[PDB]
Amino acid sequence: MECPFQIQVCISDRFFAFPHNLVEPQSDVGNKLIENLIVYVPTDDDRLYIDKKQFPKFNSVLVYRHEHDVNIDSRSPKKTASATIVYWNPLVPITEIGAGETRVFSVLLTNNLFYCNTMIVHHENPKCPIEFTYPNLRPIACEIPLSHFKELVESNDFLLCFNLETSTMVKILSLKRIFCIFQYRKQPARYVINLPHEEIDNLYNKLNWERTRRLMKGDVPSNCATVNRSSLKYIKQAQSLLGIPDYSQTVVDFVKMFQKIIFPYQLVPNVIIKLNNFDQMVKIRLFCKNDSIAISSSGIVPINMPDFSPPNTFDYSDYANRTNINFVTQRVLTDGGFSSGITVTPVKYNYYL
Amino acid sequence: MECPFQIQVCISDRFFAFPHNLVEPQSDVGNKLIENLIVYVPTDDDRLYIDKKQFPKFNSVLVYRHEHDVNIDSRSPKKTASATIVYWNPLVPITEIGAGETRVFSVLLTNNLFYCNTMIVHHENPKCPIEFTYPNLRPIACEIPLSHFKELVESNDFLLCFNLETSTMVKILSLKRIFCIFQYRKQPARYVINLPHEEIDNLYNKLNWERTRRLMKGDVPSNCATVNRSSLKY
Amino acid sequence: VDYEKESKRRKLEDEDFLKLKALEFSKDIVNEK
Amino acid sequence: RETFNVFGPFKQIDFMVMFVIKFNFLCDMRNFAKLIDELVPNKQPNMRIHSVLVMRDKIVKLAFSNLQFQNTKHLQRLIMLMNANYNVI
Amino acid sequence: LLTLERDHFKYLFLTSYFDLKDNEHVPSEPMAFIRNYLNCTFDLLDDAVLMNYFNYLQSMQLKHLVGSTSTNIFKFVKPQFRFVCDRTTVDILEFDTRMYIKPGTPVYATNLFTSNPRKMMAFLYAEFGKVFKNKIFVNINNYGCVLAGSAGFLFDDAYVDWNGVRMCAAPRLDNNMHPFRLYLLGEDMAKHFVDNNILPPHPNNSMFMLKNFYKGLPLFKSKYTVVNSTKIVTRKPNDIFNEIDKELNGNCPFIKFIQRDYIFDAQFPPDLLDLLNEYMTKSSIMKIITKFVIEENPAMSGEMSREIILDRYSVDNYRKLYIKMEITNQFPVMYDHESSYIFVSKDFLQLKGTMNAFYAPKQRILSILAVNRLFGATETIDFHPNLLVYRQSSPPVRLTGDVYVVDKNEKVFLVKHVFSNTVPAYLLIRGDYESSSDLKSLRDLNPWVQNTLLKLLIPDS
Amino acid sequence: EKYHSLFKLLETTFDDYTCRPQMTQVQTDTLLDAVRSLLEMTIDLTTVDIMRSSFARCFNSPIMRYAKIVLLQNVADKRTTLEELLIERGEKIQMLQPQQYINSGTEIPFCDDAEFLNRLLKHIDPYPLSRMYYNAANTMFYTTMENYA
Amino acid sequence: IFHLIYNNENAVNTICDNLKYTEGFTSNTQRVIHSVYATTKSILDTTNPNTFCSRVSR
């Protein structure tokens, strides 16, 4: 994928609402500013949230729904020197560009904009929402969050709904905008997405890839992540086994519970191990400030060393042999009076014992 | 077994009764003495024999039954700089320590305190009791000897009884305290332990090992030994 | 000593940014049309 | 509480009922104390009586905990006595 | 110019590589030479000796060592260690939210150290702008500037992983005096500095300094009163376990098993190993290992003023030491409440995937140490429901103390139990049982036992 | 290389083959491990001897225009009759004591969910009763053969 | 069932408590009541989310 340098993209959670102030007329080759402005939006309804009166710099303002023009190759979009072109949360390739630099504002960072040369990323202090999967909720038409803006900034229990024929990209953009609104909420808000589990998982995967793109473009890390459905099911099983009411315990706190074990016992909690495995299907390593070693799923590892020590570091032949293994297994079977379900494995060792 | 140096243990038969005089406030890193005192006892009933009024050096005194805190490794007990910690006849590992040095007084010397660095052993002139195995005896609730203290220091024929659910360590501590009282008796006292022979033999073995520990810590030899049941039969 | 004035100002803005958006999506006094 | 309320919807009626119970109780406690004043207390409590006391206190506390409910010098002195804070003066 | 012998290259490495203060033991020649080397009075030093030392480092195969035959390596800010950042980020954890780095991005530790990154930022960003120019949007903070998570510079401590994340409190606090090392992201930055002999304007100094090949581990001299010593060589963990078992059985209440936290950094010359043996790093690994069964009688008591230490000072060489129990003896810093380790006996086997769970066949018991780690297990057994043989009993077997319900349908319970030698733990039982007292929620249990229980119970579908 | 021991065992059958091979415990364990890895199962030195006898019979048999149908034999010296086995085994069983028991009466726990029954019926419909019967009967027959031998 | 369909939590609670203190509640009546309540609540939880989404639907 290639992008034309004439497009400049700014990424900011704030862009869930259109940045009227940031728009500015572009100049032609003759350095003549263009008083005509064209704003592109992903859906027709978006037009209602563009206030033409907020563009004093321009004399004429028009708004249209950006639509993939199959007749134009995005590698070289047509230019329209007669107007300044701005795209808001584009979901399809930009086939048209304005005078000077075509401006783009987006809360999402799809591949289309990923290769865009000029990338301005606004940084925010993270503020995470609460996943509240559960069958007094406040329904929210995700396609039009700004309509529910007041409720989104006031209440704390939202049922996220979508029109049947809503497109996947529209869903992704709506979710991103809602999550930005929550990022600006002082109080985290619980929400439930009225969608099939697989669809929600795919949406979360795409959002994760978008966040990865933002990081690669220089965005600040945010702990406000999301959990795949299998991971949520595992966490729920763990909480139930421990006798923890699901509504009472949040996943984040549940995981944090084992930070007391992480360092002092120099062990990786099994919950974190399982979550990492789920993400992999969709290894671990960490340390402490000034620490000389790293705790990993494999055990202790010298800092900056590979996750596994050289193969010949330790000789296990003494016990890592069929004779010893069979002897121990037979002893166990005899002592316990067992006949099946018994399995003994030699213990290997990483860098350290 | 390891012990933290912050604990100092004093062993003395006298400690069958709590040594109120020996308690003293401990100082912090800032050399500020702590006016709060926490006394730990092996059983709840023991609390009744701790007189809070006998601690002028302190402003607040609390007493609790020491209990094994499974969540704390005795190799590194939690510290509470807010109070001076004293343990009396501890039977389970000390999981908490006070400001400065955590003081311990015990008539017993179990393994837990055996490896304790600071060990102060008080020496006494031996004075043995009389084993009087025989089916006019004076019953004694061994769990609470101090209640029977007057009889223990006056009479000379005691029937040592225990509650059914009394623990082994509680039994051992009770017997040790009673034997200390007899050690201070001018007249040896006859006694009968209303327990099965094997249990009595095990208790005697453990007491012998405790005495061995005291000797290894520098205690003075005492002829006031005990005889196993087979030896008595012979 | 080039402090991250940008980050500080960004956080300060974010504090009331939601209120500003609420003002934008508030009600209007009159319907000119 | 209803019998006492017969005399009015007093603001602190529950506290009042508890106070009346404890006061009628303290009357007989003073009676016992007078009966026993001449006698010499021991340094430590009688163990059997102590066990009986603890065991009965268990039941008393259970009952009064199950039944949840809803001008300062002498008031507070007597209240401290009621709450058994023997540090009262 | 001062010179130095290969025999003193061990002293040079000792002084320049670690954060060592016990320098009084350096002979006079290496003392003066190293003093000038560290204060960067290179004009008083033989550069040929520096090249010889670099060749010595290469010969010993120091990890990440990268360099050429230019004295500018020591005379200027230069990438001295190389390694690739590869972080399997776990977003669900509140890591130290530092500037993001793209996986696979090369990272270089330079000899430069500063007491204030913000001040160096001016000059370093000037160099960065020289390298890239243009109007590239970058992530820049007071501690560095990052381009697309793939290039740039930053300041950190002298020792970072770059493959794991940062979590939890610091067992060591050397930041009190430790300046931040400079790290360079990208072959572009590394090559630029190497070719340009970059060096910040002088006001070594208070503001900043150079510590060539300075890992900065908290090294110190043991100062041990060695009652006795011996050495062994092996790559068989069972041998070390046998030594530990013998020492514990004989008279040792507990052994201090130490492993040096750098034995994997190079093929250290034996002479260098001997020199290092006099010293120890506060951050090295230690384990307080005792024996599960503790003999009741004192007949097994040994010396009360002596300790046994087993130091894995190299990859394959260990030294057993008998020293006088003395407070002044210095030791690696462990966790404030570091859990003790318990040796594994033949009576049971450690459950696979658990650091504190074991099973006794002859007893048919599954036990979980409350706060203690297992140690020495050369063998492990996979968990299986058959292990929890259902106990038959016409009247429910009564239980006392703390009891917890694991599976009411399967009559699975966890019972608090202390081994007579006062070892807290829990027994997992399955059968016809009843509790004398009220059953208790598992949430009451500590995170350690809870994690072990999750591993043992939730099937790994 | 993995199965050299089993190769040696079978090759020895080329001789008189009416003999009990002698192996160390290590050798026996190696052979059993090899066989178990080959068949991926469990197994027994009894199965080892069964294979030895079968292969010895095959090797000793001549080349024939027709397959030879035989019965297991020569597995584990004294010939015992069914009556003697009955007497001895019954005595030992009577010596044994009941590990567990139920009380009188009780009630067979029949299922009730007709929907569950229908689901199971659907799940089993494509199973040919002929094949299942054949497999079960031959399983029982071969286990009986092994016990007898 | 009616006090559930119609959002009458007071009546639902009244019925639940009366059944708690009526007849052999513990033996099987409690389980039967919980089963009926769970079935009704499952149906209502199936319906209400879709109903709300339809309400806000464009």
Numbering used by the authors:
A (entry chain L): 1 to 135, 162 to 308, 320 to 390
B (entry chain L): 1 to 135, 162 to 260
C (entry chain I): 462 to 494
D (entry chain I): 594 to 663, 673 to 691
E (entry chain F): 7 to 209, 218 to 475
F (entry chain C): 156 to 196, 200 to 234, 238 to 310
G (entry chain H): 117 to 174
What does the publication say?
The most well-studied baculovirus is Autographa californica multiple nucleopolyhedrovirus (AcMNPV). Baculoviruses have their large circular dsDNA genome packaged into an enveloped rod-shaped nucleocapsid. The BV nucleocapsid structure consists of three parts, a central helical sheath containing the viral genome, an apical cap and a basal structure attached to both extremities of the helical sheath. Herein, we report high-resolution cryo-electron microscopy (cryo-EM) structures of the BV nucleocapsid combined with de novo modeling and Alphafold predictions.
The outer rings of the basal structure and the apical cap follow a C14 symmetry and connect the cap complexes with the helical portion of the nucleocapsid, functioning as an anchor. We term this structure the ‘anchor’ complex. It is organized in a two-ring structure, referred to here as anchor-1 for its most peripheral part and anchor-2 for the inner one (Fig. 1 and Supplementary Fig. 4D–G (basal), Supplementary Fig. 9E, F (apical)). On the similarity, common proteins for both basal and apical anchor complexes include Ac142, Ac109, Ac104, VP39 for anchor-1 and Ac101 (also known as C42 or P40) and Ac144 (E27) for anchor-211. Notably, the arrangement of three Ac104 molecules and their interactions with VP39, Ac109 and Ac142 in the apical anchor-1 ring mirrors the equivalent basal arrangement observed in both our BV structures and the recently reported ODV structure. A major difference between the anchor-2 complexes in the apical and basal structures is the presence of Ac98 in the basal anchor-2, which interacts exclusively with Ac144 from the lowermost Ac101/Ac144 module. Nevertheless, this interaction with Ac98 has very little consequence on the structure of Ac144 or on the rest of the anchor-2. For both the apical and basal ends, the nucleocapsid’s elongated tubular section, composed of helically organized VP39 dimers, terminates with Ac109 binding. Additionally, the VP39 lattice transitions from a straight to a curved shape due to interaction with proteins forming the anchor-1 and −2 rings. The main influencing factor for the curvature is the presence of three Ac104 copies per asymmetric unit, each interacting with a distinct VP39 monomer.
